[PDB]
Design a protein around this ligand. Sequence first.
Ligand SMILES: O=S(=O)(Nc1cccc(-c2ccccn2)c1)c1ccc(Br)cc1
Length: 504
Amino acid sequence: DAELATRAIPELTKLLNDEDQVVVNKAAVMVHQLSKKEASRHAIMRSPQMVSAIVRTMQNTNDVETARCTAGTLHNLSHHREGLLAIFKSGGIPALVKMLGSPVDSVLFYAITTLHNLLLHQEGAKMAVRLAGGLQKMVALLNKTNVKFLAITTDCLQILAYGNQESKLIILASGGPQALVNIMRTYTYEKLLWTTSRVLKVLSVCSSNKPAIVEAGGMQALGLHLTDPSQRLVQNCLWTLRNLSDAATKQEGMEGLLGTLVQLLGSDDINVVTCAAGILSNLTCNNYKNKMMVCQVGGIEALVRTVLRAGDREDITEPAICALRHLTSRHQEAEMAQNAVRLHYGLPVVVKLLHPPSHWPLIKATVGLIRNLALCPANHAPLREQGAIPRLVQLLVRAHQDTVRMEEIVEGCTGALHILARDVHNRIVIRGLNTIPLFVQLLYSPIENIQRVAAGVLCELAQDKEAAEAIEAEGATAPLTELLHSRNEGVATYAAAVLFRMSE
Ligand SMILES: O=S(=O)(Nc1cccc(-c2ccccn2)c1)c1ccc(Br)cc1
């Protein structure tokens, strides 16, 4: 069987080396229609004699029936690791990519099939096509229409992406993302969407290029398939949107995407809820154009319940607590969003997350959220009767006695007593825990924003009579008097307003 070509092989090599571009064309066809034999393709393989001659004849031809059979051999040889090694050694890779510069898809399919098999098999072939300029062509090859073609070209761009930060920018340089997301908002085929998603997912793991797909509409197109029945896909369409969320904060025309996300917060896979609660956190950090869209679709309802699903788990807790904070500061439906937390029974599950086993970053967002919630004074009465002002004042000491920075809490944990002191009974509860020496201690901090919220909870506290008969001791009727000269002005204002309500 195979003992035939094992000696007839060197014959066909010589006739390939000939000059006449007809005694080499149809001669190479003889090699192909023999490669259809798993017994004798082994013989073409085992001896890498013409393995160069096939490669060499490919990039030195002008007839199309040549390349139809020429590269087809290279395909029909990728079926075993034995052959792959020969194709790399024979310099085929910086030549197989030249066939990507053809319109005849019969050549292109046979070509990109080999390049796919090499990457997901042949070691040491990544550095190859990276340098044969194929990163350009593979992108520019995303004009064709044969679903399975673009489903392979996108995958060959995945391996050539997960690795070097430099291989991506070629994709960022020539159409790339704007031609990529086109494959996501025009094609029904499922496998191609998943293959394309891993590309867009990999491209989104460095802030250097994240603001490129977003301007290309990547958030919009990726929002189309969030509901797609292929669950093995949506988990890629989500991790991408979580990384991208640092760019669409200042982007418009993206509304309905949120509406499909706020719904997913009550789904089966706890994975999706986690990434979904994160997608809404960074899509809200400083932008009251998305916020109002989240509220009028029941965002607060969807989040309090989601905060209540887990509780002890913190992968869910942070991006939802840190979300509700964004939906409770500087926007139109502010007061309503501060109300809606209470009506939907939020106050408990919020103050509960102050207590352990919760760790520091969640406690940051929670403390900031309680400052936010206290703006509608209806929220004061429960927080007082919820066991909150204590665990605030202790957390402050936990972050104080040793002075993310604990000082970032000392500010927010005091600045939440300032929006809490605007209620009458809470000023007694603060006064009751015998804390006035600590707020006075804070003023001496020569930092900055800590100066403000310190005097803030004192300025609110001193409106009553007995605070003058208390803060005037301990050592305040002088350090504030040597603070009015502060460069910061809201810091000076507060540092003075205390000094007033003390004389009479
Ligand atoms: O608790 S944070 O959200 N930390 C934190 C940690 C990692 C990332 C970010 C972040 C990334 C992108 C966009 C907004 N945020 C914030 C925070 C908030 C305010 C201040 Br002042 C300091 C830290």
